[PDB]
Design a protein around this ligand. Sequence first.
Ligand SMILES: [Cl-]
Ligand SMILES: [Cl-]
Length: 374
Amino acid sequence: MTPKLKLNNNINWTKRTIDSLFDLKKGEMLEKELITPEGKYEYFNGGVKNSGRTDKFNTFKNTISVIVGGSCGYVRLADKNFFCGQSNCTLNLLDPLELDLKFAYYALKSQQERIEALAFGTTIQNIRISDLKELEIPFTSNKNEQHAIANTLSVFDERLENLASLIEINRKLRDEYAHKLFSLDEAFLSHWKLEALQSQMHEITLGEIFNFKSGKYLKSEERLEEGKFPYYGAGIDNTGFVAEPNTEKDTISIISNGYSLGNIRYHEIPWFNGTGSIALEPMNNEIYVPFFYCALKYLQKDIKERMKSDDSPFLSLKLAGEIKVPYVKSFQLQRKAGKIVFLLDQKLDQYKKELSSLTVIRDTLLKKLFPDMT
Ligand SMILES: [Cl-]
Ligand SMILES: [Cl-]
């Protein structure tokens, strides 16, 4: 009973049954006519996600639950009032003074695989309540240590929650801005001082403002897994790294092959253009590349959909050169328009990177902070 990450010295860790720490109650049957997509509360039954919404609740926020039918073993700490269903079980603290709520949640959460293992069946899975009660979890009666561990794993959880909320806010605003931009919404052009676009914006083909190169190809013996300069080749993200980049920063690429065909990205750093990839290099300095990136992202679904009804093939340099995008000649005006959308893209990109990074860190710390019982 020694955690791999120790916050304090000489902590006495012990095993405790769920029965010795919690009061267990299964949820209730929610009648179908009480389920409405516009309902105030979540219906948490057998899923990790809700099984619907309602205007009824039977469980206050800040109650721990464990799924005992369906996605068995899953541990939740609800931050909103909710409707607990029959495949879900609440675990109420027997003594709040011996045991911190948030610590209790993490102690249970760290043993999630061992709770899952209690289930019978695979396709239809159930946990018996009497088995759940008998499961031992790691415990310490040191309150300072309970708070230290709960504090460490809350800051992660609260940031992830806030990040998810930020991504969703900024995804919708970004979509709105792009749509109002490229359709030239009058009220939007007024507010953002882009009235000049009304007269000046027209269609150009990509081949008139960019030059194209298809991706080059490197053997596994010519790649690194950690490097400075990313290799890009047919997945949306880098397949490893490179010694010498072959393409400059401030460039666009489009995947030409496979299932990620027609996906567009902007390059902030020098990179390697690999086999299922096309690079776009602006023909002169008067091109604000991120304007065009935004324009292509706006059209990305349309391009994919067109490539589908093409042959089911690849995107050639010929076809890519033919892509029509909105265009204004003025550099200052490309930047002024483009920046409104593109600053949200960059914000969203950092948020998604941080969310992905902290998810991994949070999983790592949760495992290391509690004694291993397998
Ligand atoms: Cl089954
Ligand atoms: Cl798409």
